[PDB]
Amino acid sequence: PDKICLGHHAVANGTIVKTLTNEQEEVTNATETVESTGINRLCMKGRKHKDLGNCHPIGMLIGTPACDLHLTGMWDTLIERENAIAYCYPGATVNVEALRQKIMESGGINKISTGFTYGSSINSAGTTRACMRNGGNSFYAELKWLVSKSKGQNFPQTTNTYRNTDTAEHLIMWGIHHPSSTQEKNDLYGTQSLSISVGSSTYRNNFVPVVGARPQVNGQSGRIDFHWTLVQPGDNITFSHNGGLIAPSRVSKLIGRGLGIQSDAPIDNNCESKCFWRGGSINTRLPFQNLSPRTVGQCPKYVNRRSLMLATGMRNVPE
């Protein structure tokens, strides 16, 4: 007799997906849930960004020549590049990574003069070939290399106090010079025993310059180790020293919030993005990605899978 038959559609080539019971289930259609493709550029549209270039974030606070255009500023996004320079004169900073993270988490930097002054037997204009500027020997912009005005003379016992009169905490950095020979130490600060004491109401510490033979870095066997702390509003911090202090001429103030990115990818001011990594940006609607476990911003979650297909159709049952 007459007849009406019910049925469903199918396709010649379906796609494979996984279910609870079957690793190899064929369906009519499916779509990817794991993003494999990123953008090999830094998508900065809509962001007031600062590209530090060859300037390392820590160099912003102490004022390395490479950071001359980055001593102050405002930004919602801060970009660090590989092999950026923090030190012209060789040295190291205590809790360097904590400090770098503070800066890369900020929305800008301001600088405030310490107002430090020095008596006539101090030369506060110490320079070095390690920090060139305009084809001449120079120094960290935000610091002063104090040495005896007369070569060999004992550096005078000296006291300098920074007073934070702001309503927000300030970040103060200073250096301690560690000479490469006793002759050098004597030339710069005299033969007396050297000591630098630092004290606020919250911070207390002491430093001693130390002579030692060392490899040259940028032509220098000497070293300047850097230290930092936070000065609270209304607090004073006092430097008590008789040679070896690399004193601050300005302190820093980290303002607001910003997103910190480490990448060498070129900036594109026409795409926008919320997710970044070493290789660039990630713009995707997909909830997962397999590009990198080291991302910043608002990102899809990293998973160790090339592909996870989500079925968008019924079982495929071809003819």
Binding site: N83, E97, P287, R294, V296, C299, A311, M314, V317, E319
Partner: protein, 173 residues
């Protein structure tokens, strides 16, 4: 499958049905024909679509870096971070595997159910005027021309119109 129709008592799908997910083929004195069913197709598609829109809902959580790409990380803290990240990654990998497996199971079975729901709807329309052949067809015990076939697809088939003719044919009395 769960509902017994797709890859079940229906032997296979129809590659030639390109204008819908579910539908009808018929045979009568005038010949044969095919047509898609809009409602069942939309029911299936809307559920898939709603599922896809739920999956685009993203985190608004801003994350900072805790691993420097361009400088050294102290070894102990670096190891703690690595242990933590790999644990998190294993959690998310497992979650994604499970999500997709579970959704796919549900998607497949939902589609099977919508096929069955159409089958059942037609069975009830036809009432006592047709019998099931077990392969997804209804043998209709009266002359059912193209308009009559359309009225079945359109859901306006009145069984009482053909009941007497159909019962006689079903009984041979």
């Amino acid at each position: 499958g769960l509902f017994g129709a797709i890859a079940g008592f229906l032997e296979n799908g129809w590659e030639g049905m390109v204008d819908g997910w579910y539908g009808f083929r018929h045979q009568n004195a005038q010949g044969t024909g095919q047509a898609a069913d809009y409602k069942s197709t939309q029911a299936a598609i809307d559920q898939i679509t709603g599922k896809l829109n739920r999956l685009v809902e993203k985190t608004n959580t801003e994350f900072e870096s805790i691993e420097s790409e361009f400088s050294e990380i102290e070894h102990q803290i670096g190891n703690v971070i690595n242990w933590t990240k790999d644990s998190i990654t294993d959690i998310w990998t497992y979650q994604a595997e499970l999500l997709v497996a579970m959704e796919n199971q549900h998607t497949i079975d939902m589609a099977d159910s919508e096929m069955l729901n159409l089958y059942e709807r037609v069975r009830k329309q036809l009432r006592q005027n047709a019998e099931e052949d077990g392969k997804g067809c209804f043998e209709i015990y009266h002359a059912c021309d193209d308009s009559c076939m359309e009225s079945i697809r359109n859901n306006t088939y009145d069984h009482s119109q053909y009941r007497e003719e159909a019962l006689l044919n079903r009984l041979n009395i």
